[PDB]
Each structure stands twice: as C-alpha cells, then as structure tokens.
Amino acid sequence: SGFRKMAFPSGKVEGCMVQVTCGTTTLNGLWLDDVVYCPRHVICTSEDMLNPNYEDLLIRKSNHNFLVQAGNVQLRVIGHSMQNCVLKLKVDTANPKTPKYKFVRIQPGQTFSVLACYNGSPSGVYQCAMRPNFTIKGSFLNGSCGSVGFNIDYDCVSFCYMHHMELPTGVHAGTDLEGNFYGPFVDRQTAQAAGTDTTITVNVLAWLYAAVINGDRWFLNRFTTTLNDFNLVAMKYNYEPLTQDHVDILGPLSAQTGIAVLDMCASLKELLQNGMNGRTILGSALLEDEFTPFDVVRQCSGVTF
Amino acid sequence: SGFRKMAFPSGKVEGCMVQVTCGTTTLNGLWLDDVVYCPRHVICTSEDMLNPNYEDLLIRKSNHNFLVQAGNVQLRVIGHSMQNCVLKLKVDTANPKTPKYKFVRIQPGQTFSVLACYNGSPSGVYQCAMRPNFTIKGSFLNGSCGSVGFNIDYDCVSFCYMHHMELPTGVHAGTDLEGNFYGPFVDRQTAQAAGTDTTITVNVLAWLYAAVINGDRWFLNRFTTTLNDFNLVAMKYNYEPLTQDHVDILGPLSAQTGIAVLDMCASLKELLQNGMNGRTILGSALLEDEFTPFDVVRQCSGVTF
Ligand SMILES: O=C1C[C@H](C(=O)N2CCC[C@H](c3ccccc3)C2)c2ccccc21
Ligand SMILES: O=C1C[C@H](C(=O)N2CCC[C@H](c3ccccc3)C2)c2ccccc21
C-alpha cells in the first residue's frame, strides 16, 4: 500500500555517464558500446548560442578537441559526426558497463525517469512526463545538458530523452537519442514559447484507479457519463480528449477495481466541476497526471528489473 | 530551475541487494562485506507472526536453513546471529560491489531515498521522510521487507532504514541497520496504532525558500512574526514547534533569498490561516514537508555523488 512517484533504479544508466568537454564548455555524454552521445551545443561558446551555424562551427573541431572522461580516466576519440542535434563521438574502447538498450521516441503523456548529471556524475533521479506541449517539467541547472531520460524493462534500458535546454518559463526541452527535438524547439537562444500545457486525462484516470486500489474512495459517485459528454467537459478544463484507445488501455484497472471506465470518467467530471473541497487524493490536493496506466499496474504489482 | 522530489542515484545500493529465503519465506537482504543483513521475521511463517518468540524460533534454524542468492548465484552461509530485530548472516565471500558505507540512526523530519526491492531485485526508487510519529509513507507490497533507505555523500552510502512492516492504516515501519525500530512498533501482527502525524515545520519553510528561488513568490507578504507567536499558530495546525536551531539551519536559504526566517514564518502563518485559495506552490496545492533545508540547497546547487 501507498503510492509514490517512483523512478527506475538508476544503476544501469550511472555506468554510462561521462563528461564531455570541448574548448571551455563541459556537459554530460552517454557512452554506449564505443560511441559517446551528447548535445551538439557542446561545441558552442555562450556567445555562439545566439545564432549558431553548427555545421560551420564543427569544421573547426577535430577528434582531439573533444575530451571525454569516464570517472577519472580519459577516452581516446577516434571519430566524430553530427546527427540532427546530437554529436556521436567514436572512442577506442567499448563501455564495459554497457547495458542492453534501445533508443525510443516516446509519445506525449508517456513517463520516464531522469538521471540528472553534472560533470559526468549522477546527482539525482526523478520521474516525469512528456507533456502534450512536448516540454518536461524537470529539475535542471547549468551543466545538466546530456542528462538522459529512460524506461527499464527487465534487462533493457530504453533511452528516450536527452536534455538540451531550459525555456525562459523554467520548463525543459530536449531530444530523442537520434538528436531530434521533441516539439518545435531549436538549440538556439531565441524567443521560444511553449504552447498550451494540457492535462493528460488517461493518466489522471489511471491515478484515480490507483487511489481506489489504495483505499481512497471518497470521490466515487453515483453517476456515469458518455465519452462525448465527458469530452465536452475535458475541453473546457484543458484536458486532452479521451478516445476509445484510452478506455482500452484502462481496461486492466477497470477490471481490477470493478469500476467501469465511464463511471470513473463521471467521477472525474464532478471533481473538475466541483473541485476537491479541501480534501486530498493519494496525499495530493490536485489531480495528478504523470502516472500512466502501465505505471499504476507496475507500482501496484511489484515488477522488478 | 524546477523543483522535484529527487532520490539519490541507486546504483551503489543495487549492488548490495540479495534474496534471503528461510523455509518458505523470502525477503530482501543487504550484503555488505561478508555480512548479509535482513529482518528477523524471515524465520517466521505467517502463522508465527501472531505472537513470535524469535529466540525460540531461531534455535530451530541452522546456517544451511538460510538461502542467500545474489543474482542467480548462491552464497554460502557460515554464521548467523540476531541483533535486535535484524539477522546478520555471515557468508564466505565479501561483496565485491561493497561501497563505502555507514549505519546511521536518523531523526524525525530527516529524508532518505528508498530502493524498493522484491526477491532481491530493484523495482523502484523514491524519496521519503521519517515522520514525527516514526512512520514513513512508503510504497511497499508483500515481499518488500529488507528494502533499505539511505543517503549518499560523495563516495559514502549512509544506511538509515530497513523496511519491516505495514500498519493497518497503510503507512510503514522499520528499523535502523542495528535492528532497532523507529518509534514504538514491534515485529508482531498485533494492534499497533501510529500517533499524531505532525507537519515538519522547518521542512515546509525550506520548501517555501525553494519556491522563492524558483520564481513562485505570490505568497510573500508584508508581515513578520515572533517564534512564540508563530508557534501558537503551529500548535493549532498540528505543525512541529519551531526552535532557534531550526532558524539557524535555515540561515543559508535566508541569506540566498534575503528573506529573514521570521518573515518567511509570517508568510507560512497566513497560508495556514487562509489556505491557498486554489493556487499552487511549486506545482503543489498543499504545503510540502518532505524536503530538508539541506535537500533544497543540494537540489538548487547541483551536488553530485
Ligand atoms: O536546464 C538547463 C540546461 C541549460 C544549460 O546547461 N546551458 C549551458 C549549455 C548551453 C545551454 C543553452 C541551450 C540553448 C540555448 C542557449 C543555451 C544552456 C541551463 C542553464 C541555466 C539553468 C538551467 C539550464
Ligand atoms: O510493506 C509491507 C511489508 C509486508 C510484508 O512483506 N509481509 C511479509 C513478511 C512479514 C510481514 C509482517 C510484519 C509484521 C507483522 C506481520 C507480518 C508482512 C506487507 C504485506 C502486505 C502489504 C504490504 C507489506
């Protein structure tokens, strides 16, 4: 019992983090096999960030301008290339601590653990979601670029995120491990505003099912609704519209609890129209949207890695 | 920028977890050097838990009744002993993955990371606090006994908690690594009720300083107060009383922000008397008490391990 924002154990990723330095700029890299992956803005000065021509800047750089250190031990750089927004540094040694892994591009609403790093070293781990506006609500300071987000299934680390930047509103943007940004952001110090941050409705439902499983049941009501009717309400409160794919994904939680999805939706609707009246759900006074249905079942069934 | 409930990287502790089985009961152990530490209720059947005589039960057990597995590899048990509520199994091999470590007994209000484990394997990591009533508000299922709580400073893992039980109210109780319970709980299936769960006032203040640092400033007011006056208010809202030791510990945050502690206290007081009026602070609609002043500075300054 209990319900916490829980991250994956970070040990498999800790072994992969290194420090990459180019000229006077330092950030974090991810060493997998004989490749180090890092943000291409490793090659810029802070002045360069106003309007960088990365191709032009990279011509001035050789293999020996890229220092890569793993713990206190220096890697030899034998090749470099740019893919989208990331640099791929070929080194002469395979990482012996390399886990089984995959690169995945996640969808908005999906969750992942972040291992925040500075200077190639782990400082902390936390969970977050890809928001519908393709930002994450991270915790990251100067030097945290190259930190990565990941999921773990049994033996296999799926890398989904690499951190690149903070917006002036204090939320975070980054890439997949092929270098392509999530959302419209670019790796330049320019005006970039994030769009509407909608609430991940299927996640909120999953969390209400979690609450029921844990004994918090005060918000169950006598009502049901329809997908069309609930969606009129979600639109008004800036919730993402619920589809039948979502309903399908909630079917295990619905079965475990005996609460039909549409009845849970009617519960949600009343909480939106009426608020929480100063009450809490699973220790929160807000509706939580950063647990996926898979997260809830995993946490409430004790899956290990 | 941003502010998250962040756990320590778990890799140093992942290497220490093992599975301990006695008869048909299985839980988690912590292998450090040539000792495996685990909850003594490893030796009970679920029937035994009603009223166990652990000394009597342990006479029936030899070295070879204790199976210890690390990954898929069996350890040889060469000695056993009971210290308070834990068992110490001497094995013939030192753990090669043993980190620098210490056993510490923490005070109520202090925070730590939990590596939840089942069958000797990591499933997730999260932060929590020792509550003033000596419970923790964990996330733990059957088989999670032996999981441990820890802090990390640079190279050194300080183990503070080992999980033993869930109360009928769904909060958690456990020991230090010498086997002594936090609070009055016993390792028996008996009526055990937790006392008043007070709010950790110095932690809430620290979190308000965190909010200020991150740009959330709406709740700053024009008032100040006195320690005596604030405490009349804390008592009424079931907050722990603030002492001058607390004020001293908040002095770095006070200096960083230029907000005198007593002025921040007056802010707190108004939030207690008036509530949040449907607003949020650092993404919460409640006042958060599970960040210590040290946690806030660590997170807001990028310390690594
Ligand atoms: O979360 C982050 C990452 C960021 C960072 O480490 N930068 C150095 C590397 C180049 C970065 C950059 C990217 C785009 C545009 C202009 C500059 C800034 C930062 C700076 C301050 C606070 C928080 C954070
Ligand atoms: O958090 C926990 C740990 C607990 C556990 O794994 N137990 C097996 C081992 C003996 C335990 C026990 C302790 C005291 C009294 C009676 C029995 C019960 C449990 C059971 C269900 C849900 C959550 C949890």
CSV table of N, CA, C and O in Angstrom, one decimal, chain A residues 60-118:
chain,number,residue,atom,x,y,z
A,60,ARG,N,35.7,23.5,-37.5
A,60,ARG,CA,36.8,24.0,-36.8
A,60,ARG,C,37.3,23.0,-35.7
A,60,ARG,O,38.2,23.2,-35.0
A,61,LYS,N,36.6,21.8,-35.6
A,61,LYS,CA,36.8,20.9,-34.5
A,61,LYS,C,37.4,19.6,-35.1
A,61,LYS,O,36.9,19.1,-36.1
A,62,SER,N,38.4,19.1,-34.4
A,62,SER,CA,38.9,17.8,-34.7
A,62,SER,C,38.6,16.8,-33.6
A,62,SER,O,38.3,17.2,-32.5
A,63,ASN,N,39.0,15.5,-33.8
A,63,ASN,CA,38.8,14.5,-32.8
A,63,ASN,C,39.5,14.9,-31.4
A,63,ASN,O,38.9,14.7,-30.4
A,64,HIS,N,40.7,15.4,-31.5
A,64,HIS,CA,41.5,15.7,-30.3
A,64,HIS,C,40.9,17.0,-29.6
A,64,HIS,O,41.3,17.2,-28.5
A,65,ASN,N,39.9,17.7,-30.1
A,65,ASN,CA,39.3,18.8,-29.4
A,65,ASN,C,38.2,18.4,-28.5
A,65,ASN,O,37.6,19.1,-27.7
A,66,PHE,N,37.9,17.1,-28.5
A,66,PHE,CA,36.8,16.6,-27.7
A,66,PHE,C,37.4,15.8,-26.6
A,66,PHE,O,37.9,14.7,-26.8
A,67,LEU,N,37.3,16.3,-25.4
A,67,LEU,CA,37.8,15.5,-24.3
A,67,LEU,C,36.6,14.8,-23.6
A,67,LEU,O,35.7,15.4,-23.1
A,68,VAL,N,36.8,13.5,-23.4
A,68,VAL,CA,35.8,12.6,-22.8
A,68,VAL,C,36.5,11.8,-21.7
A,68,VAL,O,37.5,11.2,-21.8
A,69,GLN,N,35.9,12.0,-20.5
A,69,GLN,CA,36.4,11.4,-19.3
A,69,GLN,C,35.3,10.6,-18.6
A,69,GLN,O,34.1,11.1,-18.4
A,70,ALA,N,35.7,9.4,-18.2
A,70,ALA,CA,34.8,8.4,-17.6
A,70,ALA,C,35.4,8.1,-16.2
A,70,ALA,O,36.4,7.5,-16.1
A,71,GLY,N,34.7,8.6,-15.1
A,71,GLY,CA,35.4,8.7,-13.9
A,71,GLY,C,36.6,9.6,-14.1
A,71,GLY,O,36.5,10.6,-14.7
A,72,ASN,N,37.8,9.1,-13.7
A,72,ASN,CA,38.9,10.0,-13.8
A,72,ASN,C,39.8,9.6,-14.9
A,72,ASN,O,41.0,10.0,-15.0
A,73,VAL,N,39.3,8.7,-15.8
A,73,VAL,CA,40.0,8.1,-16.9
A,73,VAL,C,39.6,8.6,-18.3
A,73,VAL,O,38.4,8.6,-18.6
A,74,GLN,N,40.6,9.0,-19.1
A,74,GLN,CA,40.4,9.6,-20.3
A,74,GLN,C,40.1,8.6,-21.5
A,74,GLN,O,41.0,7.8,-21.8
A,75,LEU,N,39.1,8.9,-22.3
A,75,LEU,CA,38.8,8.1,-23.5
A,75,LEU,C,39.5,8.7,-24.7
A,75,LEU,O,39.5,9.9,-24.9
A,76,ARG,N,39.9,7.9,-25.7
A,76,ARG,CA,40.5,8.4,-26.9
A,76,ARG,C,39.5,8.5,-28.0
A,76,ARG,O,38.8,7.5,-28.2
A,77,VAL,N,39.3,9.7,-28.5
A,77,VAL,CA,38.3,10.0,-29.5
A,77,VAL,C,38.9,9.7,-30.9
A,77,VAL,O,39.8,10.4,-31.4
A,78,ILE,N,38.2,8.8,-31.7
A,78,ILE,CA,38.7,8.4,-33.0
A,78,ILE,C,37.8,8.8,-34.1
A,78,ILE,O,38.1,8.4,-35.2
A,79,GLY,N,36.8,9.5,-33.9
A,79,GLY,CA,35.8,9.8,-35.0
A,79,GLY,C,34.7,10.7,-34.4
A,79,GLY,O,34.5,10.6,-33.1
A,80,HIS,N,34.2,11.6,-35.1
A,80,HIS,CA,33.0,12.4,-34.7
A,80,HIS,C,32.1,12.7,-35.9
A,80,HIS,O,32.5,12.7,-37.0
A,81,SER,N,30.8,12.8,-35.5
A,81,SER,CA,29.8,13.1,-36.5
A,81,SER,C,28.6,13.8,-35.8
A,81,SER,O,28.5,13.7,-34.6
A,82,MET,N,27.9,14.5,-36.6
A,82,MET,CA,26.7,15.2,-36.1
A,82,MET,C,25.4,14.5,-36.7
A,82,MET,O,25.4,14.2,-37.9
A,83,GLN,N,24.5,14.0,-35.8
A,83,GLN,CA,23.2,13.6,-36.3
A,83,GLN,C,22.1,14.4,-35.7
A,83,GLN,O,22.0,14.4,-34.5
A,84,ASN,N,21.4,15.2,-36.5
A,84,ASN,CA,20.4,16.2,-36.1
A,84,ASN,C,21.1,17.1,-35.0
A,84,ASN,O,22.2,17.7,-35.3
A,85,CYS,N,20.5,17.1,-33.8
A,85,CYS,CA,21.1,17.9,-32.7
A,85,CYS,C,22.0,17.2,-31.8
A,85,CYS,O,22.3,17.7,-30.7
A,86,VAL,N,22.5,16.0,-32.1
A,86,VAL,CA,23.4,15.3,-31.2
A,86,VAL,C,24.8,15.1,-31.9
A,86,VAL,O,24.8,15.0,-33.1
A,87,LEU,N,25.8,15.0,-31.1
A,87,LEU,CA,27.1,14.6,-31.6
A,87,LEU,C,27.3,13.1,-31.1
A,87,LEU,O,27.0,12.7,-30.0
A,88,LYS,N,28.0,12.3,-32.0
A,88,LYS,CA,28.3,11.0,-31.8
A,88,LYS,C,29.9,10.9,-31.9
A,88,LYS,O,30.5,11.2,-32.9
A,89,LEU,N,30.5,10.7,-30.8
A,89,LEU,CA,32.0,10.6,-30.7
A,89,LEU,C,32.3,9.1,-30.6
A,89,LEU,O,31.9,8.4,-29.6
A,90,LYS,N,33.1,8.6,-31.6
A,90,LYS,CA,33.6,7.3,-31.6
A,90,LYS,C,34.9,7.3,-30.8
A,90,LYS,O,35.7,8.2,-31.0
A,91,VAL,N,34.9,6.4,-29.8
A,91,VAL,CA,36.0,6.2,-28.9
A,91,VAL,C,36.7,4.9,-29.2
A,91,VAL,O,36.0,4.0,-29.8
A,92,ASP,N,37.9,4.7,-28.6
A,92,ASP,CA,38.6,3.4,-29.0
A,92,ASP,C,38.2,2.2,-28.1
A,92,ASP,O,38.8,1.2,-28.2
A,93,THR,N,37.5,2.5,-27.0
A,93,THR,CA,37.1,1.5,-26.0
A,93,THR,C,35.6,1.3,-25.9
A,93,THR,O,34.9,2.4,-25.7
A,94,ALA,N,35.1,0.1,-26.0
A,94,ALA,CA,33.7,-0.1,-25.7
A,94,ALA,C,33.5,0.1,-24.2
A,94,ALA,O,34.3,-0.4,-23.3
A,95,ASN,N,32.3,0.7,-23.8
A,95,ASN,CA,32.0,0.8,-22.4
A,95,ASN,C,31.7,-0.6,-21.9
A,95,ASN,O,30.8,-1.3,-22.2
A,96,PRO,N,32.5,-1.1,-20.9
A,96,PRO,CA,32.2,-2.5,-20.3
A,96,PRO,C,30.9,-2.6,-19.5
A,96,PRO,O,30.4,-3.7,-19.2
A,97,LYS,N,30.4,-1.4,-19.1
A,97,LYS,CA,29.2,-1.4,-18.3
A,97,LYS,C,28.0,-1.2,-19.2
A,97,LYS,O,26.9,-0.9,-18.6
A,98,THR,N,28.2,-1.3,-20.5
A,98,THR,CA,27.0,-1.1,-21.4
A,98,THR,C,25.9,-2.1,-21.1
A,98,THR,O,26.1,-3.3,-21.2
A,99,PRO,N,24.7,-1.6,-20.9
A,99,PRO,CA,23.5,-2.5,-20.6
A,99,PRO,C,22.9,-2.8,-22.0
A,99,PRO,O,23.3,-2.2,-23.0
A,100,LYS,N,22.0,-3.8,-22.0
A,100,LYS,CA,21.1,-3.9,-23.2
A,100,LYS,C,20.3,-2.7,-23.3
A,100,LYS,O,19.8,-2.1,-22.3
A,101,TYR,N,20.2,-2.1,-24.5
A,101,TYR,CA,19.5,-0.9,-24.6
A,101,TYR,C,18.8,-0.7,-25.9
A,101,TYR,O,19.1,-1.5,-26.8
A,102,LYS,N,18.0,0.3,-26.1
A,102,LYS,CA,17.3,0.7,-27.3
A,102,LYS,C,17.1,2.2,-27.2
A,102,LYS,O,17.0,2.8,-26.1
A,103,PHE,N,17.0,2.9,-28.3
A,103,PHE,CA,16.6,4.3,-28.5
A,103,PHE,C,15.1,4.3,-28.9
A,103,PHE,O,14.8,3.6,-29.8
A,104,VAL,N,14.3,5.0,-28.1
A,104,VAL,CA,12.9,5.1,-28.5
A,104,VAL,C,12.5,6.6,-28.5
A,104,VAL,O,13.0,7.4,-27.7
A,105,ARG,N,11.5,6.9,-29.4
A,105,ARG,CA,10.9,8.2,-29.4
A,105,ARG,C,9.5,8.1,-28.8
A,105,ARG,O,8.7,7.3,-29.3
A,106,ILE,N,9.3,8.7,-27.6
A,106,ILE,CA,8.1,8.5,-26.9
A,106,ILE,C,7.1,9.5,-27.4
A,106,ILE,O,7.4,10.5,-28.0
A,107,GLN,N,5.8,9.1,-27.0
A,107,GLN,CA,4.6,10.0,-27.3
A,107,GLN,C,4.4,10.9,-26.1
A,107,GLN,O,4.7,10.5,-25.0
A,108,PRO,N,3.7,12.1,-26.3
A,108,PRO,CA,3.3,12.9,-25.2
A,108,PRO,C,2.3,12.1,-24.2
A,108,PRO,O,1.6,11.3,-24.7
A,109,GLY,N,2.4,12.4,-22.9
A,109,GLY,CA,1.8,11.6,-21.9
A,109,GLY,C,2.6,10.4,-21.3
A,109,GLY,O,2.2,10.0,-20.3
A,110,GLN,N,3.6,9.9,-22.1
A,110,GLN,CA,4.4,8.8,-21.6
A,110,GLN,C,5.4,9.4,-20.5
A,110,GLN,O,5.8,10.6,-20.6
A,111,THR,N,5.7,8.5,-19.6
A,111,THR,CA,6.5,8.9,-18.4
A,111,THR,C,7.9,8.3,-18.6
A,111,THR,O,8.1,7.4,-19.4
A,112,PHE,N,8.9,8.8,-17.8
A,112,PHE,CA,10.3,8.3,-17.8
A,112,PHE,C,11.0,8.8,-16.6
A,112,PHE,O,10.6,9.8,-16.0
A,113,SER,N,12.1,8.1,-16.3
A,113,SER,CA,13.0,8.5,-15.2
A,113,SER,C,14.1,9.4,-15.8
A,113,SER,O,14.6,9.1,-16.9
A,114,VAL,N,14.5,10.4,-15.0
A,114,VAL,CA,15.6,11.3,-15.4
A,114,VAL,C,16.7,11.0,-14.4
A,114,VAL,O,16.5,11.2,-13.2
A,115,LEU,N,17.9,10.8,-14.9
A,115,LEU,CA,19.1,10.8,-14.1
A,115,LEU,C,19.8,12.1,-14.3
A,115,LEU,O,20.5,12.3,-15.3
A,116,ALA,N,19.6,13.1,-13.5
A,116,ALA,CA,20.3,14.4,-13.6
A,116,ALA,C,21.8,14.2,-13.2
A,116,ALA,O,22.1,13.7,-12.2
A,117,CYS,N,22.7,14.7,-14.1
A,117,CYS,CA,24.1,14.6,-14.0
A,117,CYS,C,24.7,16.0,-14.2
A,117,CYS,O,24.3,16.8,-14.9
A,118,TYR,N,25.9,16.2,-13.6
A,118,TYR,CA,26.7,17.4,-13.8
A,118,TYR,C,28.1,16.8,-13.9
A,118,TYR,O,28.5,15.9,-13.1
